[PDB]
Write a protein that binds this DNA or RNA. Structure first.
Length: 107
RNA sequence: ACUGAAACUGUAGUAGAACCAAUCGGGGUCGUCAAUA
């Protein structure tokens, strides 16, 4: 399970692989550097669902996210989502502390 | 401006001599499987 911390979200575009570390930056060992947040954002899906019907693996999307903290690390908790062509709407605010997933209000 | 008649294509000969349906294999035994929070 340690090895997952040095995986990066990726795609292939035509015939090149692409990487999407996004706002996070790739640390030397491949881990997200300097305690910056996980490369991918986290979508609540089987509990505290962030609904638009629930999105699906092919969905191209636009979304708000919030920086959340847990223990040794932090991550972009998705807050609200729309299909890409649709309007995302207004900025959400200070989410619930979902237990040890603590809000920051950094959105 | 008088059909020739009569005559067994049969008589003797072992489709056989030689060759392995066989060569190798313990009815045996350990750590995997799924990916995140």
């Amino acid at each position: 399970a340690t090895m997952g911390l040095q995986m990066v979200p990726a795609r292939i575009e035509g015939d090149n692989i692409v990487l999407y570390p996004g706002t996070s930056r790739i640390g030397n060992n491949g881990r997200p550097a300097n305690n910056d947040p996980m490369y991918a954002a986290w979508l609540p899906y089987y509990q505290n669902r962030i609904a638009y019907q629930m999105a699906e693996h092919g969905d191209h999307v636009r979304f708000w996210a919030e920086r959340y903290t847990r223990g040794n690390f932090c991550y972009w908790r998705v807050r609200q989502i729309a299909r890409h062509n649709q309007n995302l709407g207004n900025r959400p605010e200070r989410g619930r502390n979902y237990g040890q997933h603590h809000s920051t209000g950094v959105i």
